[PDB]
Nucleic acid binder design. Sequence first.
RNA 1: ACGGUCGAACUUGACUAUCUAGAGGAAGUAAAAGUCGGGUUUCCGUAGGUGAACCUGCGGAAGGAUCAUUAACGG
RNA 2: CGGGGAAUCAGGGUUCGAUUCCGGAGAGGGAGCCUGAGAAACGGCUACCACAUCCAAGGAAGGCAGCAGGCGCGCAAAUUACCCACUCCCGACCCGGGGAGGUAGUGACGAAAAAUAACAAUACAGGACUCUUUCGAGGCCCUGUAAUUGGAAUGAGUCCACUUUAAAUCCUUUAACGAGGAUCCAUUGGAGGGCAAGUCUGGUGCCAGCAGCCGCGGUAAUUCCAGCUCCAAUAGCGUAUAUUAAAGUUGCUGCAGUUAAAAAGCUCGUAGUUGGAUCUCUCUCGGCCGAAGCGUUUACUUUGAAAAAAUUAGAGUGUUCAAAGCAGGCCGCCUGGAUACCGCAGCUAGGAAUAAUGGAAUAGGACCGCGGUUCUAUUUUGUUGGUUUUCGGAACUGAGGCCAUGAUUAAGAGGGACGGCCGGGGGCAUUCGUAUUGCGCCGCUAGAGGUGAAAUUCUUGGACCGGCGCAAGACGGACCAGAGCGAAAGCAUUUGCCAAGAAUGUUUUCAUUAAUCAAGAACGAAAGUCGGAGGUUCGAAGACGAUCAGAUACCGUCGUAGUUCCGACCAUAAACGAUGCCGACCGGCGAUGCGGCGGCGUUAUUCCCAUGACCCGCCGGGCAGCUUCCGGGAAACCAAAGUCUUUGGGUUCCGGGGGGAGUAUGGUUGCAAAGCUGAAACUUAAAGGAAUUGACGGAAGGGCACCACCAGG
Lengths: 129, 28, 141, 149
Amino acid sequence: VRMNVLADALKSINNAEKRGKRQVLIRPCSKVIVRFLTVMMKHGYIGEFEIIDDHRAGKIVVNLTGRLNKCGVISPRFDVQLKDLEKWQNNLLPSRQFGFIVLTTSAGIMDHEEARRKHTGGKILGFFF
Amino acid sequence: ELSRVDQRHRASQLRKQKKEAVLAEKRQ
Amino acid sequence: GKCRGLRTARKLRSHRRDQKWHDKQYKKAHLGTALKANPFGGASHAKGIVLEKVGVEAKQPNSAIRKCVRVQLIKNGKKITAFVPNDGCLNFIEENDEVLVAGFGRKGHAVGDIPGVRFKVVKVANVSLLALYKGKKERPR
Amino acid sequence: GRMHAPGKGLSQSALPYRRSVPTWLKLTSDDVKEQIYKLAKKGLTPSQIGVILRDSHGVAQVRFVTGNKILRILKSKGLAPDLPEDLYHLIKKAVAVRKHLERNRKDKDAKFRLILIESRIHRLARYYKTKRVLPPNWKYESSTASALV
RNA sequence: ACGGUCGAACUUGACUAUCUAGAGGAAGUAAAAGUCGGGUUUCCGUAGGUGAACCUGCGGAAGGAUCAUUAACGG
RNA sequence: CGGGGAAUCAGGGUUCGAUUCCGGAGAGGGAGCCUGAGAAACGGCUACCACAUCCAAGGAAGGCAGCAGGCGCGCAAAUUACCCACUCCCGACCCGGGGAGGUAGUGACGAAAAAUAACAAUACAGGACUCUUUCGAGGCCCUGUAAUUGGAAUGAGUCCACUUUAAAUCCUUUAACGAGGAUCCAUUGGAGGGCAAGUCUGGUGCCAGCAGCCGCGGUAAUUCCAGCUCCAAUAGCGUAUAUUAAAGUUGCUGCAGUUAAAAAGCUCGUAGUUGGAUCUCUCUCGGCCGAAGCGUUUACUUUGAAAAAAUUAGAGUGUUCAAAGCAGGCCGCCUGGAUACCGCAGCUAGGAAUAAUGGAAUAGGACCGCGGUUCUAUUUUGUUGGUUUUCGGAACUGAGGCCAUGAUUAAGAGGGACGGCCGGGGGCAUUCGUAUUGCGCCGCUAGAGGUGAAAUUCUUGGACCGGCGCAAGACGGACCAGAGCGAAAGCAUUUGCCAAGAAUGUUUUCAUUAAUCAAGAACGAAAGUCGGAGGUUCGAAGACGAUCAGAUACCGUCGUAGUUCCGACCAUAAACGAUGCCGACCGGCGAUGCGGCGGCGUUAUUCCCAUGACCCGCCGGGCAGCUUCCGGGAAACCAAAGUCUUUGGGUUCCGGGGGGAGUAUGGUUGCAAAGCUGAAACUUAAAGGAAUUGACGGAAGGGCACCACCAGG
């Protein structure tokens, strides 16, 4: 059945970004997906998105800009300590110049640079470049 | 052979045979 | 597909060791049967007493006769065949001579033109075959 | 995708976004409750009560009008059945298939479908024991199956 | 010295396991140039035919080279 | 023996740790003890067991896995030396003792530094600067050959002495001697490719031999044995073996399962694993603060304290450099002897996203006050004996007020309902069709059968044939389609009954009840085995008949088990899509089956209304097809075998070069046949998968020739 809806959302937006489309419909909508899309938007990788509100689990329509090469999710959500984050960003990111391991800490869902800044460790969610 | 005590017993028997042969040769 | 949960560690390690048993190198190293069937018993060199000289026919596409020596090892009593390497070195080996024997290099596999021989003669009567071949030492008897 | 069949059906209900009561419905919550009570005294399952209320009385969703669902109204008043709806239906189906099997020994298809029915019964029994709906010592038996229905 | 405790070990049968002599039996190897002398496409599972192959009975596959025709049908 | 640790290594990891530090164990094997604070002690005792010494034949004495040493064992490992001077330990003790430890000897285990010579002039030789149209002319360096010369510095060694040291040795320091190439002389492997460097010369002739692998050698050997030359590393270089990286060939990172090795025949199902949204700090005691509770508990993350040293990373420091060491530096002083890491598990204080878990739905639920019953207050009834001091605290309870009083919704998750259908889905009974075989009767005839030909066989006691019936078991053709149903194997005459099922439709109900699934359980083509019945056709075996240098497979006639039904067994197929199941996204098209929706019209001889059949679109689930440079792949091909080095959606099974071999053995099931699980020794440099050309066809068509034929000379 359907598990880990963030994987479905990232796979859908990656498939549509590879196809050259301008908008993606992803369903269902959860709060972690919204935070991931917000993190990508603050770095200017996707753009504006709308949360279509059903009384069920909602839907999202995101707008695409061709700035995204690969958006990916890491399953299972491994425990990333702060000392071990360098190995993770050596494995997943394509270069030291760009790319983002999204990870959730008790301070919120953020990037690896913000996790370095705030001295907190968390669980890994994704990467995008 | 298995059964560690039996393997060590085999080794002890071979030891005793070689020791008997050597001691018989050195008495001459 | 692989199980990629968080609590699936024992499944992964059990599967890895069970499929580790399906390797050839791992099974030859760890089963303890090829170690007991090895005449040397996991040793670099062995020392034996010469029983006979054998002319082993070469494998078909090369037509020659290899001068090997059938010896009986001291420490376990096994009969093995060792190839005497160079030309004229067979005349240094005599029957009922003490020989130091090592393998060829393929770790239990028959090497090259000689069928069924894993070993080669290194020393004859406590002097090497190379020193006798080069005329550097004399052998006692 | 069905759990015992290889079919993948999509047929289901689709509520609109409006949870509010329609304007043309001049029925208060207590009148709907009394209709549910008299249907229960007539003797019906909650699904059949909902079907009668939808088809005849025009009540689309009872929990949108009354604010409570049918089984909770029956349980709060005290007219809910001892064993639940779907469990009773599955046990009755098992009883009918078992009676057919004692009639006809050579029916292999009936035996296989009976095994599937009892698998469903055991799954529902485990779920209802987890939620403390059924007592923990409750057990389905093949011999004690028709007496419960 | 009696009794008790801990208790090495000794003797007797059973289950074994190991070391080590063996009459004989069946073989093979080196030495005898000694004596006599056509069919099948490729298979699978079972059963029979002298064990196997192989062939056949039954049930299965293609992992085997689709040419020609095909609009009326109402009075 | 276990750790500290070691080797290798991007990251993950893999392997080793007998061995000097810590802890444990044991003194040939077990056992029992004495003394002592401490021993089940063995350089203490007592036994038995196994070895063994002196013998005067009665007896006595044993314990090197302590230091040297010896035997034996092996591929494999040092002196029967000197000292208690440094380090500490013991004792009645500044004084004695220590095979602890130090010092030398053996030592190419391994690690560090580092000789095997350099320069000047001449003779050639290049590369450059200046002048010349150029040739050339020079003073600018460089290189070796020097079958050329020439002195200068040396350490190896010989060896006074000093120094080192318990006494010595070595190192360091210094007298004297000590270098011309026939010396004070550098080796170990190789020269076809991998892999650097000869198509040199002689000998051999598939011999001797070389070769890790491919391969070389059968008279020109780039590969053998040698000479010369050349190449690599260098006081070191080979070979064998274990192990590590290469190996993304064990894959967590990070492999694979259409055709190359591989997905269980199919479905259920416990354990395991994974699991959809959704919810934004305070009342008392003491000095604005300290105590008391925290807050449902966690997992996660961060900080703090603990985690022996030695090893590792690393700070400082000219051990002459370095490996090392913890020293040292300045004219009595000044300093150092850091720091980091030390998984996991246990402590500790913050964070509250993520992932579990709970808190009120028989309301014996929170918060307030109004009361009862029982147990109790350790002080205020100056000293009291008291029946009562009062007050205050705990547990069971009666009503009341108060809470916006208390249930997130209804997944393009699932279960269950209700509806009209739909299907060769299943079980039971029933009905019909023909063919074949056999029998009875009638008719007319000498042939019928079978083959490439024949032959066996039947047959005027009348075969075959034609006609009328009867019976027996069998089989459900044509309709029958890339159509349908079923979990799969499978399912096709009519009717009735029985219990199921998908899909569709719902503004029904439950509210996570789910997905994949070791153990376990049902079904499971054909063939086969037990007990019964029946045998129409067919038919393995078998019998004949044909056919042959050698036929013993093909062919023809007959025919046993079986093929059929009933009840028990077996669980096997190319049980195939040679392609696990669930879920998401990425192109298009119009045919078909079922269901639903919207419709001009034709039809039931124009139908009076709905209803069935067609026709046109739409939606949902399916069996399929076509098209496409979405992208994949070794490719053929594939809308999945795609969304893969831009590698992580959940989860089951399963592969690791070909054979041995699905074999032996063991276990288990079966009456048996056999099914399931399942090696090793050994053997081998390959085996395979996809495509690409076409010698050669015993493949076929045409054309030509009196060096081919025909009719002839």
